[PDB]
Design a protein around this ligand. Structure first.
Ligand SMILES: Nc1nc2ncc(COP(=O)(O)O)nc2c(=O)[nH]1
Length: 279
């Protein structure tokens, strides 16, 4: 198959535009084949987010054919964003945050990432508590609280794929994301990573968030590596750590990774693929 695509993260901060246009150039030049544009943080939020991501999207589109993803769970944002050059929606609520999202994706003929969101699925699980609240969903949710992570993931996905099926999004336009880092424990995070092929067995490409996740940070810390992001040493170790997950991921054929440091992950992707595609 084709080697792992690197998706570089561009978070527009609430000039902000010239700064996002600058990061894009940088990531492209580092070998990003896709960029993920986010503008998060009511009609007031929908409008402010749109006025964040839309100008950025247009400007990238003026100079580049790079695949652009809109990181939004709000259908009004993804709609403005596709109308401007975006190719796909990265939905961190996996179609559960907005009932009209499926239609917006279906209507635009777009690709979509359906992330498993365990924070929505288990709002009171101790790991979820620190997370904000996603969505404008689930019933009396009482089974969820209790399921193993992989049966849990499955149930969320069952729901969300049905939502997509009814909107008529072509099955070949869907990418699944296990939701690593989101109200999952260390062990659940690692188990889901250990079992990426089970998720491949379902038949969809896998979009993976491998970058600067607290569980990898803590493996570094417990093991004598400096992890303070405000040091050169700590900053680099954190990005190298992630590149290692990309190495493992790209080797088993994960289709996309979503990442901060494109260059360290391009080194992982090249080594892992050369091995994978040996013959
Ligand atoms: N699909 C997907 N989307 C995401 N959006 C944001 C963040 C966390 O923050 P960031 O914006 O700095 O990456 N992580 C993910 C992830 O793992 N997967």
């Amino acid at each position: 198959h084709a080697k792992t695509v690197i998706c570089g993260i561009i978070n527009v901060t609430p000039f902000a535009l010239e700064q996002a246009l600058q990061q894009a150039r940088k990531l492209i030049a580092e070998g990003a084949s896709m960029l993920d544009i986010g503008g998060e943080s009511s009609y007031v939020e929908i409008e402010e987010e749109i006025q964040r991501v839309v100008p950025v999207i247009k400007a990238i589109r003026k100079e580049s054919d790079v695949l652009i993803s809109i990181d939004t769970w709000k259908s009004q944002v993804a709609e403005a964003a596709l109308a401007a050059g975006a190719d796909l929606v990265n939905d961190i609520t996996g179609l559960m945050g907005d009932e009209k999202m499926p239609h917006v994706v279906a209507e635009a003929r777009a690709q979509v990432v359906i992330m498993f969101n365990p924070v929505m699925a288990r709002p009171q699980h101790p790991s979820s508590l620190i997370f904000p609240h996603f969505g404008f969903a689930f019933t009396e949710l009482a089974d969820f609280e209790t399921l193993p992570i992989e049966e849990l993931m499955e149930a969320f996905f069952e729901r969300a794929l049905a939502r997509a099926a009814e909107a008529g999004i072509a099955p070949e336009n869907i990418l699944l994301d296990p939701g690593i880092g989101f109200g999952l424990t260390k062990k659940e995070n690692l188990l889901l990573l250990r079992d990426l092929d089970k998720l491949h067995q379902k038949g969809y490409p896998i979009f993976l968030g491998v970058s600067r996740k607290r569980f990898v940070i803590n493996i570094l810390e417990e093991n004598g590596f400096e992890v303070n992001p405000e040091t050169e040493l700590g900053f680099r170790n954190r990005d190298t750590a992630s590149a290692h997950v990309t190495s493992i991921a790209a080797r088993q054929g994960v289709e996309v990774v979503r990442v901060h440091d494109v260059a360290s992950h391009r080194m992982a992707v090249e080594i892992a693929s050369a091995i994978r595609l040996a013959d």
